[PDB]
Motif scaffolding. Structure first.
Motif, PDB file in Angstrom:
ATOM      1  N   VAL A 148      55.070 -23.069   0.789  1.00 63.46           N
ATOM      2  CA  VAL A 148      56.225 -23.959   0.762  1.00 63.46           C
ATOM      3  C   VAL A 148      57.118 -23.750   1.981  1.00 63.46           C
ATOM      4  O   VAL A 148      57.570 -22.638   2.266  1.00 63.46           O
ATOM      5  CB  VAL A 148      57.056 -23.775  -0.524  1.00 63.46           C
ATOM      6  CG1 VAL A 148      58.436 -24.388  -0.365  1.00 63.46           C
ATOM      7  CG2 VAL A 148      56.333 -24.399  -1.702  1.00 63.46           C
ATOM      8  N   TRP A 149      57.353 -24.839   2.705  1.00 64.51           N
ATOM      9  CA  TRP A 149      58.215 -24.825   3.874  1.00 64.51           C
ATOM     10  C   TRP A 149      58.868 -26.193   4.024  1.00 64.51           C
ATOM     11  O   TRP A 149      58.269 -27.209   3.668  1.00 64.51           O
ATOM     12  CB  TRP A 149      57.403 -24.442   5.120  1.00 64.51           C
ATOM     13  CG  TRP A 149      58.214 -24.230   6.361  1.00 64.51           C
ATOM     14  CD1 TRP A 149      58.603 -25.181   7.257  1.00 64.51           C
ATOM     15  CD2 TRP A 149      58.773 -22.994   6.824  1.00 64.51           C
ATOM     16  NE1 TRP A 149      59.349 -24.615   8.261  1.00 64.51           N
ATOM     17  CE2 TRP A 149      59.472 -23.273   8.016  1.00 64.51           C
ATOM     18  CE3 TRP A 149      58.746 -21.680   6.352  1.00 64.51           C
ATOM     19  CZ2 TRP A 149      60.137 -22.281   8.741  1.00 64.51           C
ATOM     20  CZ3 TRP A 149      59.405 -20.700   7.075  1.00 64.51           C
ATOM     21  CH2 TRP A 149      60.088 -21.004   8.254  1.00 64.51           C
ATOM     22  N   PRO A 150      60.111 -26.222   4.528  1.00 62.15           N
ATOM     23  CA  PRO A 150      60.846 -27.457   4.828  1.00 62.15           C
ATOM     24  C   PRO A 150      60.033 -28.460   5.653  1.00 62.15           C
ATOM     25  O   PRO A 150      59.197 -28.046   6.455  1.00 62.15           O
ATOM     26  CB  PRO A 150      62.047 -26.950   5.623  1.00 62.15           C
ATOM     27  CG  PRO A 150      62.311 -25.602   5.049  1.00 62.15           C
ATOM     28  CD  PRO A 150      60.964 -25.030   4.671  1.00 62.15           C
ATOM     29  N   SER A 151      60.279 -29.755   5.460  1.00 57.10           N
ATOM     30  CA  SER A 151      59.465 -30.782   6.111  1.00 57.10           C
ATOM     31  C   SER A 151      60.176 -31.511   7.249  1.00 57.10           C
ATOM     32  O   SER A 151      59.586 -32.377   7.895  1.00 57.10           O
ATOM     33  CB  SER A 151      58.996 -31.820   5.086  1.00 57.10           C
ATOM     34  OG  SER A 151      60.079 -32.590   4.593  1.00 57.10           O
ATOM     35  N   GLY A 152      61.443 -31.187   7.484  1.00 62.41           N
ATOM     36  CA  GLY A 152      62.187 -31.835   8.549  1.00 62.41           C
ATOM     37  C   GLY A 152      62.703 -33.213   8.177  1.00 62.41           C
ATOM     38  O   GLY A 152      63.752 -33.649   8.653  1.00 62.41           O
ATOM     39  N   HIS A 153      61.965 -33.904   7.312  1.00 62.56           N
ATOM     40  CA  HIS A 153      62.379 -35.209   6.813  1.00 62.56           C
ATOM     41  C   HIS A 153      63.329 -35.033   5.637  1.00 62.56           C
ATOM     42  O   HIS A 153      63.541 -35.950   4.844  1.00 62.56           O
ATOM     43  CB  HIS A 153      61.165 -36.046   6.405  1.00 62.56           C
ATOM     44  CG  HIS A 153      60.232 -36.352   7.537  1.00 62.56           C
ATOM     45  ND1 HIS A 153      60.199 -37.579   8.164  1.00 62.56           N
ATOM     46  CD2 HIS A 153      59.299 -35.589   8.157  1.00 62.56           C
ATOM     47  CE1 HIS A 153      59.288 -37.560   9.119  1.00 62.56           C
ATOM     48  NE2 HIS A 153      58.726 -36.364   9.136  1.00 62.56           N
ATOM     49  N   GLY A 154      63.892 -33.833   5.539  1.00 62.45           N
ATOM     50  CA  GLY A 154      64.914 -33.527   4.561  1.00 62.45           C
ATOM     51  C   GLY A 154      64.383 -33.103   3.209  1.00 62.45           C
ATOM     52  O   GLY A 154      64.797 -33.661   2.199  1.00 62.45           O
ATOM     53  N   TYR A 155      63.470 -32.131   3.203  1.00 62.96           N
ATOM     54  CA  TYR A 155      62.997 -31.453   1.988  1.00 62.96           C
ATOM     55  C   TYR A 155      61.867 -30.482   2.309  1.00 62.96           C
ATOM     56  O   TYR A 155      61.413 -30.396   3.449  1.00 62.96           O
ATOM     57  CB  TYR A 155      62.518 -32.438   0.916  1.00 62.96           C
ATOM     58  CG  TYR A 155      61.527 -33.471   1.391  1.00 62.96           C
ATOM     59  CD1 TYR A 155      60.168 -33.189   1.441  1.00 62.96           C
ATOM     60  CD2 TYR A 155      61.947 -34.737   1.772  1.00 62.96           C
ATOM     61  CE1 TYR A 155      59.261 -34.137   1.865  1.00 62.96           C
ATOM     62  CE2 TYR A 155      61.051 -35.689   2.198  1.00 62.96           C
ATOM     63  CZ  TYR A 155      59.708 -35.384   2.242  1.00 62.96           C
ATOM     64  OH  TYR A 155      58.811 -36.335   2.665  1.00 62.96           O
TER      65      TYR A 155
END
Ligand SMILES: O=c1ccn([C@@H]2O[C@H](COP(=O)(O)O)[C@@H](O)[C@H]2O)c(=O)[nH]1
Ligand SMILES: O=c1ccn([C@@H]2O[C@H](COP(=O)(O)O)[C@@H](O)[C@H]2O)c(=O)[nH]1
Ligand SMILES: O=c1ccn([C@@H]2O[C@H](COP(=O)(O)O)[C@@H](O)[C@H]2O)c(=O)[nH]1
Ligand SMILES: O=c1ccn([C@@H]2O[C@H](COP(=O)(O)O)[C@@H](O)[C@H]2O)c(=O)[nH]1
Lengths: 397, 397, 397, 397
Positions: free
Chosen positions: B331-338
């Motif tokens: 699990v890691w942030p997606s940059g598209h806001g989640y």
């Protein structure tokens, strides 16, 4: 590793050791010293002077009496009849209620012990020139009860162990007081703090004038006889109990509770005056007024048999005034339906009155009426400072 | 009968002895045997076989690795780079979340101890005919940090204590692993149960191919290299602490409390698919729908510095399905806001990704994108069984 | 006096010693005797007779069986097949629910112990004239399971350790019972009080008739064979546990709680009768009426696997009456949708039925239907005294 | 400094030692003496006189009986039949309810012990001139039950160990009482405080007149026979238990609770009178009136089998009056439907009546009617002081 499965020890819980004792036993505690072998040593400079023995103390000679011997002293006369026991007092003057007392080192102990059984001695320092000559007697007569302490001449003293002293160029001498009892040891004369738990002294010595003094015109006729007292060759001491002597540090007593003795409500202030119904106005009694039969009515004092009671005021700066502050008084019923406050000269004269009224006596006896304060002592007749506090003294009889 | 009046003993209450210790001291208790001398004996038949020594155990040779050596192996090539420390694992396949592991007798201890300081050894059993010839290297190079574990040829290994083995008619050999440290003893590599309280291994040995194998046509070209590990001549052990290894009896864990990791409310079910915003649709990521930008949004995992995190599902019978159950994910942030759920092949490939993202990396790096699952693994694209439970794994980095 | 300031002792509180043990350890207590050296002596008249040994007891020969031997006994015939273990019973007739039992001195112990491992022996007192001749066998065959206890002739007994006895002018003989086990010691056959915690006997001895008796016309043909049992040369005893035998003083049991077994509400009173649906009216079953299908419906008994159940009434003065009080019964489902009360002759015939129904059997088998009470025993058909209390017995199978 | 880390000692809490025992064991306590070596010494004057032995006491000769021997005494006659056991009484006259009793030093012990087993002796001091001649018998016949204590002549006494004494110029003699029992020791005759826990004496001695006295005219014909009793050569004593004898200091008993025996409500006052339905008006019975059938109805006394009951009033200054205060009475049903108060002469005559009514008797027997008080003793017929308190006595029969 191996199991000690054999039955564990038994044991019986206590909470504390030990308010007694401390002769020979090891006392475990929690010492605040840094070491488990910390016992203070006493250097050559920090020398252990005494010698802290009950004997060490009962060997110093402390003063206790001073008799003035005079040529005027008859062939038949006594000088002192002081008690032959370690509890021999010397009242010091003033001022507060409880009077202070002087006591020899052989007085302070056995004030801590119950019994003593010892032999004692008295050094009679007779300050005298070589041009003063006389002869003194001194005799320990065992079995001296109350009434039998009088009815005592210098002749019947010569019946018991007695001594006669010749003085020309030899001032003082020392008489060793014998110890004759039925009892091995001897219980306290003063038992504190408990009234009926105190038995009188086994006997007493007297110092009569066997031969009156003959002083030549260039040396005075009156001479001081200082008297010292210490435990003799074998003053023994038996068993530690409650001390019969107090401090000297803080001579106060918070008066419980608050049973302060004072006149009945409405009989204040009160001055010393006279009354036609009290020795025909020949003696002082407390009055709350100058009119008909205004005599101070005082509360009844419930005293158990074998005791006596009188009064000493707390503050002398509040007492009634005549020629002197009437700080001492005795209380007894007046027959006219109440108890009257009879001021005395001092505490001794208040006690002696209680020795005669509680000794099953009356008020109209000559023995009591010579302890009443004369009416020419009424003075300016100052009233008291309201109804100040008196405290009720107690003594066995 | 006589009174023991001397001061009683002192004593300081405790409640229990003794969760430690048990080397040499007698332990009193209440034994339920009938006798106070009841210690079980061991007859001639009931023979005491072992010999229960920490040494006795760390001397048996337990298997730990199996390398397949082939003629195709170049002159410059490595076979295994396993760690030179008692805590050397061997993962066994499947199936539940927490993966089981194989450990030599010199692995189970010192799993109980903190430090060890010992010398070790490896038996390289090389199953080979007499018609197989080759030469293997093996070198204990102390000071092998994280990044420096690569950048490692068979030549620089020849710089540290290393050994070359010739094999014709002699199959196996044994290399004794040296112990080079700055520290006398060596603390646990795996510290349980505590994440940052675990220090890496002092060094590692490798087994390169010094000379490739030359197999004649009537014996096969690939050959198994079984590897065993045991405590060497002086594997020492220092101090008992919490074991870093568990049972094998009941491999369950009741998930507290109930902090089970699972997708945000509304993102269920979810199958592995592709996304134009995730490696240009070249790799698998969890989707909760087939339409525009329906990517599974996952809760943020708060991990303390010096650690990493990934996910292993509880039941494989509830995981999303492609060519295989995607039981592991990162699990890691997606940059598209989640944060996005990125399925991995196995736990190792999920860890390695966490070693690169938490190692201060990005998503558009080639090192990470070779751990992403290809899109031809999407399979029939079965959805999950709702939003099944994942649990968050932790490891230092 | 000096301060013991060194650290006091440590100590760990217990509350009581010691419900065990008492072999060799000194037990401190509070003795109510006047003396601390008060131990009772045993004078020449107050002689200590026994000799209180587990051995001392297991050496007396107590009676346990009585076999009647007759000329009519075939060449192939058995006389008793009693169990070769200390827990060998002898039921005594009557009357209350729990039946009393006779036990040899080697029976009462090891009723107190778990294991025994011993060798035993049987004295076969054969009361016989000199004009009676015969030959008896006796063989300890280890490994006698349940089913295998039958399928046993006098011939296969001759395969194990066995003995043949000739009797003309020598009546009795003594056979020492061997001990063949895989286990050193042997656990209780009767474990009290616990049903599944009881393992069967290691083996048994039989006494077949090797040669039938030949009695001349002036001495009778039937002869009593009294049988005694005691611990042999080395009957050992292992470990004290809960006794498997009770008192004889107060043979009562307050029935908890109050789970007394009795017919379902409405099926009272109930007499023993017949039913066309129960062995075609050929056997007795409890009926609550004389009309169509009025069969007593009984509560279901929940018995754990490895056990069996039947019923014995509390008071025989309340049981249903035929030719005899049906004090014993067995309960099993009737197929017509309930459980029926099937009266038996005695407790043995109720147990044996439970050995066959709980042994996974049916009701229409000949083995069970020979334990059912015949219908000519229905008698005057007296009804019970209401619905009296039955208690549910339990035994392993 | 160094840590004593080895397991602390075990220990089992008790609370107190020790209400027993004190033969030989050291008792630790908190002594209030100033010293830890404080044991009182006994000086030459403070001599330890006794010799505090159970034997020391049971060797002094205490008086117990006084027989008047007269010429009128027939050839066949008895003088005393007192009991041969240490618990031999002598009632002293008056006055309160519980009567006081005289007991020899061999009476007070073993009043403290359960059993005695000893040999005893009696000194018969016969005050006689030389001109008085006679012969006395004395025989210890073991096995003297209740009824068999009579039916006893001086002839059958000559069957057991007996002695004849000739007296001319030799007054007294001493007979040593043999001890014949089935029991080694002998339990208390008087067991306090417990009624049925008291077994009678093993036997008794008598003193018959073997030859009547022949007194010449100048010395009187009646002569006193004083009797003393002490433990003989081997009066033993067995085991300390509750004393059967009380103080003499405060002979009171606060009557619980408040179960004071007194007439039924309404039958007060009550004087001693006569009744045609009570021995045909020939004996005294309590009446609450002078009219028809006004007989005092008394509460029923529930006495357990093996006991008897009668009454002794608390204050004699409240009893009914005839010729003497009727302080003693017996209560028994009257047949006319209630219980009647029958006054007796003394406590002995009240007991003897209870020995006959509770001995399964009637009222119309001559044995009881010779214990009833004659009607010429009715006196002035003073009524009681209301309904004063009686207390119910108890004794075994
Ligand atoms: O509870 C126990 C168990 C054993 N012992 C042992 O018995 C001996 C005699 O007891 P005392 O102390 O003389 C001890 O020295 C000790 O060895 C005890 O005293 N108390
Ligand atoms: O409370 C006490 C009283 C006396 N002692 C005595 O003093 C000795 C020295 O104490 P530690 O133990 O060496 C002991 O052996 C014992 O005889 C104690 O220890 N503790
Ligand atoms: O708390 C303490 C203080 C001192 N000692 C001393 O140390 C010795 C050694 O202990 P253990 O008992 O052998 C004892 O005999 C005693 O003299 C103790 O045992 N315990
Ligand atoms: O809890 C303990 C630890 C040690 N010991 C040691 O074991 C010895 C044997 O025990 P007992 O007492 O004979 C003791 O003297 C003592 O030195 C004990 O008794 N109890």
């Amino acid at each position: 590793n191996p199991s000690y499965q054999q039955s564990p020890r038994h044991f019986v819980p206590t909470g504390m050791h030990s308010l007694a004792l401390g002769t020979n036993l090891v006392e475990p505690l929690h010492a605040l010293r840094l070491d488990a072998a910390g016992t203070t040593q006493h250097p050559v400079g920090c020398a252990p002077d005494e010698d802290m023995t009950v004997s060490s103390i009962a060997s110093r000679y402390g003063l206790i009496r001073r008799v003035q011997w005079k040529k005027d002293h008859a062939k038949g006369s006594l000088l002192l009849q002081l008690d032959a026991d370690p509890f021999v007092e010397q009242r010091i003057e003033g001022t507060n209620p409880i009077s202070l007392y002087w006591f020899a080192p052989v007085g302070v102990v056995s004030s801590m012990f119950m019994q003593w059984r010892g032999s004692l001695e008295y050094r009679f320092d007779i300050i005298a020139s070589q041009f003063h000559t006389g002869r003194l007697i001194v005799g320990y007569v065992p079995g001296l009860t109350a009434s039998l302490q009088l009815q005592m001449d210098y002749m019947k003293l010569k019946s018991s162990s007695y001594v006669v002293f010749d003085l020309q160029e030899s001032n003082s001498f020392t008489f060793e007081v014998p110890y004759v009892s039925y009892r091995p040891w001897w219980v306290r004369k003063y038992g504190g703090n408990y009234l009926p738990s105190s038995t009188d002294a086994p006997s007493t010595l007297f110092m009569y004038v066997q031969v009156p003094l003959i002083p030549m015109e260039a040396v005075s006729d009156t001479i001081d006889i200082n008297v010292y007292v210490r435990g003799g060759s074998s003053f023994e001491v038996c068993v530690p109990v409650q001390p019969s002597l107090g401090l000297n540090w803080n001579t106060d007593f918070i008066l419980r509770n608050d049973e302060e003795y004072r006149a009945k409500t409405g009989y204040a202030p009160y001055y010393a005056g006279v009354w036609h119904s009290f020795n025909n106005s020949n003696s002082l009694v407390f009055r709350w007024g100058s009119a008909s039969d205004q005599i101070a009515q005082w509360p009844t004092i419930s005293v158990p048999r074998g005791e006596l009671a009188f009064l000493r005021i707390k503050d002398g700066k509040q007492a009634a005034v005549g020629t002197q502050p009437w700080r001492t008084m005795v209380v007894w019923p007046s027959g006219h339906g109440y108890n009257i406050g009879i001021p005395t000269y001092n505490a001794e004269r208040a006690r002696q009155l209680a020795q005669h009224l509680y000794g099953g006596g009356s008020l109209t006896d000559e023995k009591a009426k010579q302890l009443f304060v004369p009416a020419n002592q009424q003075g300016p007749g100052k009233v008291s400072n309201g109804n100040p506090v008196w405290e009720v003294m107690r003594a066995p009889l």
